[PDB]
Structure formats: C-alpha cells, structure tokens
C-alpha cells in the first residue's frame, strides 16, 4: 500500500524530528519553520496534527499547543504525487508541513519588556579546600 | 611556580566551560550553579569576574551581567591550598565559584504569567510536490 488517495486520509501527525518519504524528490523534515515575525531560531512546536476538513485539493486544518506568545502565520501542507506531481494519489508518508511562527499581540508586549539585563554583584564567602 | 599567596590573587575570571587545576582534589568547573529559587537547568551566566577587596577572612566581590529576572543568592569562592587545606599559598588556577541563582521580584512576577499555552489552528494551503 504505497499509494493512497488523499481524500481518504483522515489525519496527519507530523514530527519535527522525522523525515518525509520520497521517490522523485528529497526527503525533508515532516515539520519545518520557514519564517514569521518570531522567526525559527527559538521556540518551535515538535508535533502538529492536521485533520482532513474536505475536498475540492483537500482542506487541512493543522493544530498544536503554542505558548500564548506565538501564533501560526501562513501554513502549507504538501505531499508527493505518487506517479507524478499531477497525480491524485500520493506517496505514503510523503506529506509535510511548513509554517510561519508569529508573535501574538501579547508576545509583542512581552518582547518589548524582555532581554533587559543588569550588573549584579555578590560578596562571596571563601573557604580553603 | 604553580604556587601563589591567595593574598596576591587580585582578580579572577571564571568560565562555565573550563575546569580548575588540582593536585590533591578533583578538577571541577570554574563556575557551577548549585541551587537557588530559579534553579540551574535553565538560564546560567557563562563568565563571572571576581575582584579581591581585602583580607581579614578574605573577601571577594563577584559580578556579572544577569537577566533582570535573576539575581545571585549565596556565592562561595574556594581555591586549593598548595601544601594542604591549611596553606595560605594556593595552587595556581585552582580557584572556582559556586552560586545560587534566585528569581528577582520582577522574575517571580514574570514566572507567574509564563508557561501558558493555547491551542492554535491554521487552515493550511496545499499543493502537490
């Protein structure tokens, strides 16, 4: 069962540490951040679940638990067409998700008050060892 | 040689990723977090400078730039006495610092409003690759 009809797939569970399957292309991470106002160097989700919400090009809704400082920007699901990129069947395990991570309104206000530092000194105790 | 009066050691620059010298003991990191209300498994300074301000017991003032949510708790400097633990000469490069890392009032308030999450969904775009 290597080919599967896209419309018969209930749901996708995509991991930041697993790779997609591929025949014509190159395997890529199932889950990858590619931009947004928060960028990708810091916080990133590890697992995201997409549910099939209808056909037309299936409509995916991809959800995860995010720290309230972050929100999803644009997100694209893509899978590998089985016999060609114009195929209606897709290769099993080929689906992946790219996402943009934005700062929420609260994230922005928290950004404004973050990163501040102060010089802190302490009079240490000493013991000979 | 490898032997100097602690009295003469004016300044120390201690690194989180460097080890002390040792003869009688085991080499340990120049800089180790050991406790405090903030704990050690999170934010840690990498470099701490200490300045000798007098002897009586000898007194060290250890300073670094800290994120404002954090402050030093008790800090302890200790060097390996050369001929023994009773010796006023110490082994060159054997001085190290352990510190407790506490939350400031600001840090505690930021803790009270941190770690909250929301379920975020996104209606993804789709395309065949």
Curated annotation (Swiss-Prot), chains A, B:
Superkingdom: Eukaryota
Subunit organization: Interacts with STIM1; the interaction is inhibited by the interaction of STIM1 with EFHB.
The protein's role, per its UniProt record: Negative regulator of store-operated Ca(2+) entry (SOCE) involved in protecting cells from Ca(2+) overfilling. In response to cytosolic Ca(2+) elevation after endoplasmic reticulum Ca(2+) refilling, promotes a slow inactivation of STIM (STIM1 or STIM2)-dependent SOCE activity: possibly act by facilitating the deoligomerization of STIM to efficiently turn off ORAI when the endoplasmic reticulum lumen is filled with the appropriate Ca(2+) levels, and thus preventing the overload of the cell with excessive Ca(2+) ions.
Lumenal side: 1-129
Subcellular location(s) per record: Endoplasmic reticulum membrane
Protein's name in the database: Store-operated calcium entry-associated regulatory factor
Record note on domains: The cytoplasmic C-terminal region mediates interaction with STIM1, while the N-terminal lumenal region mediates regulation of SOCE activity.
Protein family membership: Belongs to the SARAF family.
Tissue expression notes: Highly expressed in macrophages.
